Enzyme design. Structure first.
Site, PDB file in Angstrom:
ATOM      1  N   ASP A  35      -6.863  60.939 -57.384  1.00 13.84           N
ATOM      2  CA  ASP A  35      -6.396  60.250 -58.466  1.00 13.84           C
ATOM      3  C   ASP A  35      -7.056  59.238 -59.029  1.00 13.84           C
ATOM      4  OD1 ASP A  35      -4.873  58.930 -60.210  1.00 13.84           O
ATOM      5  OD2 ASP A  35      -3.427  58.049 -58.909  1.00 13.84           O
ATOM      6  N   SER A 199     -12.252  58.885 -77.241  1.00 15.97           N
ATOM      7  CA  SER A 199     -12.433  60.169 -77.800  1.00 15.97           C
ATOM      8  C   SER A 199     -12.700  59.930 -79.269  1.00 15.97           C
ATOM      9  CB  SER A 199     -11.357  60.866 -77.714  1.00 15.97           C
ATOM     10  OG  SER A 199     -11.164  62.113 -78.207  1.00 15.97           O
TER      11      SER A 199
END
Length: 330
Positions: A35, A199
């Site tokens: 994770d 992004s």
């Protein structure tokens, strides 16, 4: 040193991925959820309330000759999906795919929330976010990667998650045969303890690319792709019959639909998520309404590039002095 381990989807929807981990001496092998959005290595154990264990493999520290109780140490985590768990702490030897750390904090669960009990395939979590998020009190503990880092050939690990197929976590090296083209690296902020990056934009299907900054985290421990409401609305508008359902808790779509791809930007590079990756199947058994894999991050407070996105790429988690993230197509 290096390590390499196969990671396997837990179910037919790729809801999560498990990777075998050796703990203790002799080894006790548990299948953990790696994770990159958290920083505790915690396990089902011989100490877990009996009624809260249902098919999981447990760690029994009393059977490990290298286990040592970390005096006074406890942990407690409540995840961003109502999930929680807590317990005490041992140090022990932990190996992943041939890479060994001695003295790793292994957080043994006394209590786990229902969602963990109900998932028989996940024996615990292995956190790979920054150690600043580790919950051990009163003395915070380091992640497996933090402990291994200086011994690794290169201070990196890579995630190569499969779509309906096995994949790989590598530690200490970049497998240049595992991706196509080049790896594009992008800046990381560690200010919130995550692999947080920006992004450069997105496209829906064969539509024009929209240049816009989207700050979010690379999170292998989250199933779906959580993005701003504007972006998500633009995606589902291209799926006939899709709608946001308050009762279901997100966007649903007719199971007969063909889903468009979703592209996200990494600098000037582009990662294409095939439409099939965005299908999470019937909302309930037998239903012809299907759950979407791209959902709004409104009210999460952060955008999350979860498995839906990451499994479309070969992802480098570069833990150099100034960390960065790399993405390649594959």
């Amino acid at each position: 040193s290096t390590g390499s381990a196969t990671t396997t989807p837990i179910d037919s929807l790729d809801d999560a991925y498990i990777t075998p981990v050796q703990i203790g001496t002799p080894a006790q092998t548990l299948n953990l959820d790696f994770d990159t959005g958290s920083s505790d290595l915690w396990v089902f154990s011989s100490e877990t309330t009996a009624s809260e264990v249902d098919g999981q493999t447990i760690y029994t520290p009393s059977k490990s000759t290298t286990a040592k109780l970390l005096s006074g140490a406890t942990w407690s985590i409540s995840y961003g999906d109502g999930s929680s768990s807590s317990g005490d702490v041992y140090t022990d030897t932990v190996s992943v795919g041939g890479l060994t750390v001695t003295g790793q904090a292994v957080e043994s669960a006394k209590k786990v929330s229902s969602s963990f009990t109900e998932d028989s395939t996940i024996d615990g979590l292995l956190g790979l976010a920054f150690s600043t998020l580790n919950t051990v009190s009163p003395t915070q503990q380091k992640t497996f990667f933090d402990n291994a880092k200086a011994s690794l050939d290169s201070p990196v690990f890579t995630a190569d998650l499969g779509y309906h197929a096995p994949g790989t976590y590598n530690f200490g090296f970049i497998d240049t045969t595992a991706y196509t083209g080049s790896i594009t690296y992008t800046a990381v902020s560690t200010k919130q303890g995550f692999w947080e990056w920006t992004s450069t934009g997105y496209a829906v299907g064969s539509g024009t690319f929209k240049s816009t900054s989207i700050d979010g985290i690379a999170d292998t421990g989250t199933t779906l792709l959580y993005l701003p409401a504007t972006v998500v609305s633009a995606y589902w508008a291209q799926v006939s019959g899709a709608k946001s359902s308050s009762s279901v808790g997100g966007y649903v779509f007719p199971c007969s639909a063909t889903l468009p791809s979703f592209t996200f930007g990494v600098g000037s590079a582009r990662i294409v998520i095939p439409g099939d990756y965005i299908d999470f199947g019937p909302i309930s058994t037998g239903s012809s309404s299907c759950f979407g894999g791209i959902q709004s991050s409104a009210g999460i407070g952060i955008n999350i590039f979860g498995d839906v996105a990451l499994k479309a790429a070969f992802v480098v988690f570069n833990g150099a002095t100034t960390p960065t993230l790399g993405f390649a197509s594959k």
